[PDB]
What we know:
Protein name (chain F): Translation initiation factor IF-1
Domain S1-like (chain F): 1-71
Largest sheet of chain B: 5 strands, mixed
Distance between the termini of chain A: 25 Å
Order of helices and strands of chain A: HHHHHHEEHHEEH
Keywords (chain F): Cytoplasm, Initiation factor, Protein biosynthesis, RNA-binding, rRNA-binding
Helix content of chain A: 40-55%
Number of strands of chain A: 4
Organism (chain F): Thermus thermophilus (strain ATCC 27634 / DSM 579 / HB8)
Number of domains of chain A: 2
Oligomer: part of a larger assembly
Largest sheet of chain A: 4 strands, antiparallel
Number of strands of chain B: 5
CATH architecture of the largest domain in chain A: Orthogonal Bundle
Main location (chain F): cytoplasm
Structural class of chain A: alpha+beta
Strand order of the largest sheet of chain A: 1-2-4-3
Bound molecules: magnesium ion
Amino acid sequence: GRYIGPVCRLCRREGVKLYLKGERCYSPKCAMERRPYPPGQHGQKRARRPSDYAVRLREKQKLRRIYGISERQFRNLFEEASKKKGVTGSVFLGLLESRLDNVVYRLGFAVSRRQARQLVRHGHITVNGRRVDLPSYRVRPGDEIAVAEKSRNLELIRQNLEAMKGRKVGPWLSLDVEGMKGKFLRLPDREDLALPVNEQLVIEFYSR
Amino acid sequence: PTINQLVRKGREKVRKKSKVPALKGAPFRRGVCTVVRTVTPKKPNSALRKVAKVRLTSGYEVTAYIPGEGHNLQEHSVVLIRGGRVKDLPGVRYHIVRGVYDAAGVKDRKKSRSKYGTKKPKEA
Amino acid sequence: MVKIRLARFGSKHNPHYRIVVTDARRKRDGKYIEKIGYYDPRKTTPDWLKVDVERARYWLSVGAQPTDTARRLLRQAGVFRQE
Amino acid sequence: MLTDPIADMLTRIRNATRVYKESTDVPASRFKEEILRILAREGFIKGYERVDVDGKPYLRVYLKYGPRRQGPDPRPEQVIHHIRRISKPGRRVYVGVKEIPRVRRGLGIAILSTSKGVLTDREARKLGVGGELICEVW
Amino acid sequence: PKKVLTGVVVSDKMQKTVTVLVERQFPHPLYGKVIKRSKKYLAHDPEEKYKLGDVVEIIESRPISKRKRFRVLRLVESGRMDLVEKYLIRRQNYESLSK
Amino acid sequence: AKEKDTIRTEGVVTEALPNATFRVKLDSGPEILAYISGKMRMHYIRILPGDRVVVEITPYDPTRGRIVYRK
RNA sequence: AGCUAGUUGGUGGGGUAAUGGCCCACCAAGGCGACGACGGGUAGCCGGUCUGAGAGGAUGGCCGGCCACAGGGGCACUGAGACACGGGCCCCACUCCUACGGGAGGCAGCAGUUAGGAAUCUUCCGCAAUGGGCGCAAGCCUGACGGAGCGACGCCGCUUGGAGGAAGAAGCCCUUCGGGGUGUAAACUCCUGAACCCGGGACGAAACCCCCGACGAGGGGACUGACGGUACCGGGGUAAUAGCGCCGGCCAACUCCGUGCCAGCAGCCGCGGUAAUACGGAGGGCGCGAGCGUUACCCGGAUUCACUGGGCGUAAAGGGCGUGUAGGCGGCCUGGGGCGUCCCAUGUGAAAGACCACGGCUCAACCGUGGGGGAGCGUGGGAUACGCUCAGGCUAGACG
Lengths: 208, 124, 83, 138, 99, 71
Ligand SMILES: [Mg+2]
Ligand SMILES: [Mg+2]
Ligand SMILES: [Mg+2]
Ligand SMILES: [Mg+2]
Ligand SMILES: [Mg+2]
Ligand SMILES: [Mg+2]
Ligand SMILES: [Mg+2]
Ligand SMILES: [Mg+2]
Ligand SMILES: [Mg+2]
Ligand SMILES: [Mg+2]
Ligand SMILES: [Mg+2]
Ligand SMILES: [Mg+2]
Ligand SMILES: [Mg+2]
Ligand SMILES: [Mg+2]
Ligand SMILES: [Mg+2]
Ligand SMILES: [Mg+2]
Ligand SMILES: [Mg+2]
Ligand SMILES: [Mg+2]
Ligand SMILES: [Mg+2]
Ligand SMILES: [Mg+2]
Ligand SMILES: [Mg+2]
Ligand SMILES: [Mg+2]
Ligand SMILES: [Mg+2]
Ligand SMILES: [Mg+2]
Ligand SMILES: [Mg+2]
Ligand SMILES: [Mg+2]
Ligand SMILES: [Mg+2]
Ligand SMILES: [Mg+2]
Ligand SMILES: [Mg+2]
Ligand SMILES: [Mg+2]
Ligand SMILES: [Mg+2]
Ligand SMILES: [Mg+2]
Ligand SMILES: [Mg+2]
Ligand SMILES: [Mg+2]
Ligand SMILES: [Mg+2]
Ligand SMILES: [Mg+2]
Ligand SMILES: [Mg+2]
Ligand SMILES: [Mg+2]
Ligand SMILES: [Mg+2]
Ligand SMILES: [Mg+2]
Ligand SMILES: [Mg+2]
Ligand SMILES: [Mg+2]
Ligand SMILES: [Mg+2]
Ligand SMILES: [Mg+2]
Ligand SMILES: [Mg+2]
Ligand SMILES: [Mg+2]
Ligand SMILES: [Mg+2]
Ligand SMILES: [Mg+2]
Ligand SMILES: [Mg+2]
């Protein structure tokens, strides 16, 4: 299922911050600020000019790592995007974002994408007033994500909301911090996202 | 070839000549050994590269190659061929897949295991 | 005897039907003559049955014979209704 | 046997352009004239007059050229960079209006003989009629 | 409609019958170049009205014999034996290519 | 695993076959087509019939020996 | 490379629902064939499926259509319909009982057995649904179907936690001896609770039936669930499976020790003949992950059968040359026909699928609804440049 394991390792590998921790990764601890070299026994060792293939692959990994998806799932999403009318690159990213867990992470209900997923999968997340426990679940625009009433009083969620209190969500989103609701208003874009990825590369990779 | 020529004769559709006659186009044939012998490899490799003549459920009598170090492979050993000509030994087009019937897991391989039929070692 | 009847479609536990006119001697899922309605028993949709009425009437007239369930469905969506 | 006229004419044009002959000359025909007209309007040529070369009706074809261009290869940039008969005798080519070739993604053209006459691909699409696809030019 | 064909009478050698020969200029599915294939049709000739080298219009009928399924509907032009001639020569040729 | 198993027995060079293969009759007995060692080949060490050579022999097939040492 | 003698056509008849050499009697001597007949091999065929940018190439499992066949081979009978899977007769082969004369069979129905095989399922529940047959109806059947089981066999969804947390414990590994690595990984605190347990509990099922109303419409009534106490919902509630391939190049990912052209690896190239980023282990890393690999097959890449889209001086490839038959191909002008060609209209292109849109399953896979597209082929009309054809003329080709 999950990546299920050492995370900031991934960050180190992809040579860039990937924020799969949410709190710690923000702090002076992401093992990029303190240290920043690809992990294992050949870390500080010379980084030889990578192949064209290699770069593409790494980009894909970065992207996949960011949205925490089994490769198969990712591939399927890509395929769907390709099939769909509109720019595959941008559209693919939009689709990825649309993922319920990812939306939750972005709305802020949870600080970490992993954490968001976990929250979703236990049933603390509710689209349109229903227990929507499927991290996969792509949400359409115009849909209200809210913490379940039975999960509003729970401390973690409250803490997250407090953290998010005042500080802004996304341009594509809306959040009501009081009622713990949050409307997935429009569908997202490319400029709307801070991503260390170049989705063109991903496309190229898939094309091969 | 002029289009009239094409019309008359057309293209000889390129028939893919089958590289393995294990038969049925079947993935594996289990045959019974005759001779586990040892063979001198071709021009640039020198070893004593092991092998087994195998007589089949497909009636053919073909020498498969045994991968891995050692083999409880004997003579009247019922064994599963795999298919995949080995470059060195001339006219040996098959393998014995290990970890089935008479052939057994290459003992205490820790790395590339599933390819040698070696069951995961019980770590303490 | 060309029947009006319910060709089963959908899936497992997803039963769906087409109100469909076919010769009696057919695979119940087989090549029917005309799909003249469809019907979902699980009533998931708001439009859980929609029968084209005129076509059904025509079929009845030539002497197509509605199967009990099919007949019921037709009645529900007013084909036998005479005003 | 001279065994295609149209193709020969096209080829003649091509050959004259390759060595920057100001004007080629090709034995006259109605069909050929029509083709030339289409070419002419499109702009692949300055135009044609119809002389009588040694007894017989002949079309001069005044080949257009891009300007004498600076540097190695002083060779005036051809306008008919490439010309190709498509329906040749033997394999004749008839395309429905839907099947009409978009030559160079729009840039050069495809001459189509239609029931409506000889007319560019564009014209064919406009009139909504296919025909025998003579050639492409770019 | 009943299938209407146009062909030349290559043979009269059976009572009340004509071997008509229909050309059918179809484009060749793969290459495109339009082939000119041709088939013999045995055609019921009610009177022996039609002689060799008659280009006729032929219609599919109920059977009136194993490989004889066509009324001769009507005549077009008659006497063009040139067309019978080519066919005949082709038929003759075979006698060569053998063992 | 790499099994230590071979027999390091000596033998008279009977006859030269191709490649650098020899039917060498051992100390104990049976003549086996014995191919020259890789090491020997590397250091160009010729052999002719009428020699006494070290021949490492297999347990799996005691019919194909291997001429190890330079005579 | 020739095949054919009921073979081909006729007349007459028989037979059939009906045409017909289907069959026969009698004539006539045809008929098919290199535009590839006959023969051999192979094979169910298609909607589709895969693959491909496409053209195409493969393939026809499952679902739908059609055929054929129900041990092999005949043959009818009955019937609306069969030459009849769970009807009949006969011969043959096999098994089964035989009081040896004789009979009994037929799983390519579901399930199962055994064999063959690399390999393929439970001697399951149910008529509740939908369909079938019969019957006034009740109802009875129904291995159709609905379901359940088993198989990571595929697809999709999910779990094996999450937040913090050292300028970095140990263990293991490298080291140039400082240190690096594994790695925030763990430990540990907090959180959440797959599992699991308790409570509830479906939708799928409203008809058929009965009454009022004419046994019509129409209205009311009453019954009925295999799955299944399942899904799901409410409460309860523990940190709770990771593996497999690879790590010379192609190809994402390197160091050490073992080893010494051995043992081995290999898809190709090729590593191994004492510093192996290629073998075996170790650490480390990369890829995917309930999978990952290998095999086999298909397409792809392979424009490597090239129609789109290759070629032939030397690389494989121009016949040794003529002269020619079939065929292919065809100069210029005018006119018709309009067969090819194009266009328009409509018919067809079933359903499913595939395309799109929405919808329903907590998402998806899956499914449903609606739309469109569609190569092709049919018919009506039209168009005339091209090709075709017929007619007329012309001299550039050709011949004289
Ligand atoms: Mg999965
Ligand atoms: Mg290996
Ligand atoms: Mg008769
Ligand atoms: Mg016959
Ligand atoms: Mg007779
Ligand atoms: Mg056969
Ligand atoms: Mg077969
Ligand atoms: Mg086929
Ligand atoms: Mg089928
Ligand atoms: Mg049987
Ligand atoms: Mg029988
Ligand atoms: Mg039979
Ligand atoms: Mg029966
Ligand atoms: Mg029978
Ligand atoms: Mg039958
Ligand atoms: Mg049976
Ligand atoms: Mg069975
Ligand atoms: Mg068994
Ligand atoms: Mg067996
Ligand atoms: Mg089953
Ligand atoms: Mg029962
Ligand atoms: Mg029923
Ligand atoms: Mg009774
Ligand atoms: Mg019974
Ligand atoms: Mg079933
Ligand atoms: Mg499963
Ligand atoms: Mg398995
Ligand atoms: Mg953690
Ligand atoms: Mg708790
Ligand atoms: Mg319960
Ligand atoms: Mg743990
Ligand atoms: Mg690499
Ligand atoms: Mg390798
Ligand atoms: Mg190694
Ligand atoms: Mg697999
Ligand atoms: Mg190809
Ligand atoms: Mg070509
Ligand atoms: Mg070539
Ligand atoms: Mg040559
Ligand atoms: Mg020559
Ligand atoms: Mg000649
Ligand atoms: Mg000729
Ligand atoms: Mg012409
Ligand atoms: Mg001609
Ligand atoms: Mg359809
Ligand atoms: Mg549909
Ligand atoms: Mg939905
Ligand atoms: Mg003329
Ligand atoms: Mg002369």
